[PDB]
């Protein structure tokens, strides 16, 4: 409820460049700034002889609001004269963009190369890692296991997610006849074992899934990924979505972060509902475990009378100590809205003590401009009803606006004590930023005719020292005791806070709590 709507930060880009397909924050542990990593997988770079390679852009937050991108500045490499090795054109560089400290992992899933043995084209997939002044290329699927039987059509880098111990996890849903694969390698191994002359690098700590039987064919394992603890130790585990899991029902696999064994499995309910289009692991009830959030944007809910209407569905599973899960589903609101498309955790949006989540419908609302829903969790699960509605503001141009398809939260850019949210609308190639306004809680009073009206307030994070209220019966310090006055059937009073004076330099107007009343 605390997200600002009046004055959001906007971020444009090249026309039709899919600016906003991937959005992520850039917090460095080397400076005192916080930038915005936004990917444009259909932009045109200055690489000679490459068309629509794509790029990742850094966008300033406290500046003239400019945006500037250099993971690579070279054309196709040559394997022997008169024939090239790789083809980075239309490679979709920017489909995935992650960050952790000074690390930027940007991947191009539709990257093709000529395997050394034959003369062919295989979407193995490519990635790039930047730890500061050292940028390296990471292509785990560009190995000698070739063709669709191996990792030739791997599409590596389709989905990525960092690990708390720097064990980046890669999902390529086309490896081994599209059964899917997941690959995890250390950041230390990636930078250390990097050459511009060795195409296939075996590393040493390679955690990769192996081929299965033909029953699990065309399952697309690696569509989405997430990191979270599910075995009990300190090592994060890999959660991946398998939308076509052998009956198109959809399954979600949770592996291990150490030896990568099958820990837990979920299964879908409706066929062709894409149970596993997007996953997100966080804590929604503050039990120090990790919950799971599987999106099914194509789920067809049975309507009131007898009809089936596609509204989408997100499954909420709560981890328990014994390992079992408590599952609860919340269905979409609009029809053909793709609710359950980008589930982005937000952390403590209002600092109530429990983390909150954001679920977006990219093609629902007014003129199908996209709407982002905000949910706040309690120590019972999470609230079924939404806490805030966010709406697009740019009408579709040729392409649907697709507002909310890409999102990223749980990061404070203002350093104001509350995290923030970034929303990417690549159809209208726009990126937006919403700042969580500070939250105040007020406890009221009002205990010949003798009446005495009391009030006090407090909050978290950056907040002005004194708040000017306005009370009428028919200056209070933030953190002080009960201040009031006494002056000499129903008696009515209200407190209307003066937001304008309680603002800050940019303005960031504070907001009152949700359950608190104002009339007594």
């Amino acid at each position: 409820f605390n997200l600002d709507v009046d004055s959001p930060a906007e971020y444009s880009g090249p026309e039709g460049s899919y600016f906003g397909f991937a959005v992520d924050f850039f917090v460095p542990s080397a400076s005192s700034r916080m930038f915005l990593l936004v990917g444009a997988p259909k932009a045109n770079t200055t690489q000679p002889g490459i068309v629509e390679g794509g790029q990742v852009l850094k966008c300033d937050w406290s500046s003239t609001r400019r945006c500037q991108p250099e993971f690579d500045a070279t054309g196709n490499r040559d394997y022997a004269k008169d024939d090239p090795l790789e083809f980075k054109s239309h490679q979709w560089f920017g489909a995935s963009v992650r960050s952790k400290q000074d690390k930027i992992l940007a991947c191009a899933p539709l990257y093709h190369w000529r395997t050394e043995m034959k003369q062919e084209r295989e979407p193995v997939g490519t990635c790039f890692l930047q730890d500061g002044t050292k940028t390296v290329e990471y292509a785990p699927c560009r190995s000698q296991d070739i063709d669709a039987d191996g990792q030739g059509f791997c599409q590596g880098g389709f989905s990525i997610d960092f690990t708390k111990a720097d064990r980046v996890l890669l999902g390529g849903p086309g490896s081994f006849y599209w059964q899917g694969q997941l690959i995890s390698d250390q950041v230390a191994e990636i930078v250390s074992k990097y050459d511009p002359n060795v195409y296939s690098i075996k590393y040493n700590n390679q955690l990769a899934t192996r081929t299965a039987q033909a029953i699990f064919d065309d399952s697309y394992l690696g569509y989405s990924v997430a990191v979270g603890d599910f075995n009990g130790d300190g090592i994060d585990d890999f959660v991946s979505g398998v939308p076509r899991a052998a009956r198109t029902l959809g399954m979600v696999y949770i592996y291990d972060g150490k030896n990568m064994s099958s820990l837990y499995n979920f299964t879908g309910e409706q066929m062709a509902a894409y149970f596993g289009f997007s996953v997100a692991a966080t804590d929604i009830n503050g039990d120090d475990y990790a919950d799971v959030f599987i999106g099914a944007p194509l789920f067809m809910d049975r309507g009131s009378d007898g009809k089936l209407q596609e509204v989408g569905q997100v499954s909420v599973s709560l981890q328990r100590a014994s390992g079992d899960f408590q599952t609860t589903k919340l269905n979409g609101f609009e029809v053909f809205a793709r609710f359950g498309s980008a589930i982005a955790p937000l952390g403590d949006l209002d600092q109530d003590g429990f983390n909150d989540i954001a679920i977006a419908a990219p093609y629902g609302g007014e003129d199908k401009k996209g709407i982002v829903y905000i949910f706040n969790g309690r120590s019972t699960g999470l609230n079924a009803v939404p806490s805030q509605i966010l709406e697009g503001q740019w009408a579709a141009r040729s392409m649907p606006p697709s507002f909310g398809y890409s999102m990223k939260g749980a990061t404070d850019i203002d350093k104001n004590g509350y995290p923030d949210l970034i929303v990417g609308a690549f159809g209208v190639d726009r990126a937006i930023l919403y700042r969580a306004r500070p939250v105040i809680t007020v406890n009221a009073g009002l205990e010949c005719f003798n009446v005495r009206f009391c009030l006090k307030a407090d909050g978290k994070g950056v907040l002005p020292r004194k708040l000017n209220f306005q009370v009428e019966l028919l200056t209070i310090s933030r953190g002080g005791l009960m201040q009031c006055e006494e002056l000499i059937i129903t008696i009515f009073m209200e407190y209307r806070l003066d937001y304008r004076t309680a603002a800050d330099t940019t303005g960031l107007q504070p907001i009152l709590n949700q359950f608190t009343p104002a009339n007594i």
């Binding site: 239309h90 979709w92 489909a95 899933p109 539709l110 093709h112 034959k118 003369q119 062919e120 084209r121 295989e122 979407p123 669709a148 059509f153 599409q155 389709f158 849903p173 086309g174 599209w178 064919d217 065309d218 697309y220 939308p243 076509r244 009956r247 198109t248 409706q270 066929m271 062709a272 894409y274 289009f277 944007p297 194509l298 067809m300 009378d305 007898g306 089936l308 209407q309 596609e310 029809v335 053909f336 793709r338 093609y363 392409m399 649907p400 697709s402 398809y405």
Partner: protein
């Protein structure tokens, strides 16, 4: 009250619903009863659009060489206006589905087994619905096959484009529409397109230009089971899954999500498609179910089907047990608590209920 305001008799041989435009008028917080009478007219015109999938189905092309004549000889015994159409599909001619590796595989995708093949195409409309059954034969002889790397194919794109394109396919406004769907592989359902770089959702508009190809194959994603269902009922199209024995159970579960669909066990070479389609006619017109458009939000209607022999089935809106054509009736209630159309699935005739609150 409920004024009939319009009523014509149930036609004898090829009007199906008896009351055409009722005149509801409700005082707030009340409910009255309607009337309906379905009539599956015998010898109603039929149009069959044979949507075929062509490399493992190259023997099917030879085994259905003379199909229009065999169709006519065994379909005019139950109808007098039969039209046949032909359309084909393989998959989208985009990167992670087609053989672009050898420089000569764009023109000849089968340059691995030492044969010839057509370049892969998304959807091809070949023959419009014509009453001449010999044109089906002479156009199906000029068909060859292509090859796709993946196992699933672009079947749903073909079904969608056949449904929404109306001038190109020539579905009659007054006819019994049959759509055949023959394949031996799985299907690339909606959202199976960002692997190919396609993230623009299907709009439903039909893009088969004058070149008879789906021009938005490499630009738009596959349709879903909701967009297809929304358009298969708008144009009153019946879909038959003439699939093989390894995909029957898969396509049966898709079938039990869309109203008006059935499956058939298509042989290895499509050597029993005539009997399959004939039996699919007696399985499509043997079920009568009612569906509603534009129902007011402040209205709730119940459905008491009265079928077979004076039954009182309390709640069902559909009836089973019809052979060719029968006169069945469903009573209706409608509560207001303070134009909506009733029509059967697969037909254009409807009871346009006029509601005026007083």
């Amino acid at each position: 009250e409920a004024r009939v305001l319009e009523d014509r008799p149930l036609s004898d041989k090829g009007t199906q619903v008896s009351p055409q435009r009722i005149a509801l008028r409700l005082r707030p917080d009340d409910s009255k009863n309607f009337s309906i009478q379905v009539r599956q007219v015998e010898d109603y015109p039929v149009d069959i659009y044979y949507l075929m999938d062509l490399y493992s189905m190259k023997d099917d092309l030879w085994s259905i060489q003379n199909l229009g004549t065999k169709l006519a000889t065994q379909m005019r015994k139950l109808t007098s206006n039969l039209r046949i159409g032909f359309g084909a599909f393989v998959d989208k001619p985009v990167s992670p589905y087609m053989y672009i590796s050898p420089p000569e595989a764009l023109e000849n995708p089968c340059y691995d087994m030492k044969t010839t093949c057509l370049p892969m195409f998304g959807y091809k409309h070949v023959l419009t619905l014509t009453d001449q059954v010999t044109r089906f034969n002479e156009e199906v002889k000029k068909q060859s096959v292509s090859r796709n790397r993946d196992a699933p194919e672009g079947g749903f794109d073909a079904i969608m484009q056949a449904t929404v394109c109306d001038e190109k396919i020539g579905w009659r406004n007054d006819a019994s529409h049959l759509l055949v769907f023959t394949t031996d592989a799985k299907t690339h359902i909606a959202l199976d397109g960002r692997l190919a770089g396609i993230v623009q959702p299907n709009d439903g508009q039909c893009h088969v230009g004058s070149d008879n190809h789906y021009s938005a194959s490499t630009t738009m994603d596959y349709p879903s089971l909701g967009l297809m269902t929304e358009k298969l009922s708008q144009k009153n199209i019946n879909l038959i899954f003439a699939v093989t024995e390894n995909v029957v159970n898969l396509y049966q579960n898709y079938s039990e999500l869309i109203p008006g669909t059935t499956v058939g066990v298509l042989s290895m070479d499509s050597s029993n498609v005539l009997q399959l389609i004939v039996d699919a006619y007696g399985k499509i017109r043997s079920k009568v179910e009612l569906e509603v458009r534009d129902l007011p939000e402040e209205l709730s209607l119940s459905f008491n089907a009265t079928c077979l022999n004076n039954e009182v089935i309390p709640g069902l809106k559909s009836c089973m047990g019809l052979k060719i054509g029968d006169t069945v009736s469903f009573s209706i209630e409608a509560k207001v608590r303070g134009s909506f159309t009733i029509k059967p699935v697969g037909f254009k005739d409807s009871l346009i209920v006029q509601v005026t609150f007083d």
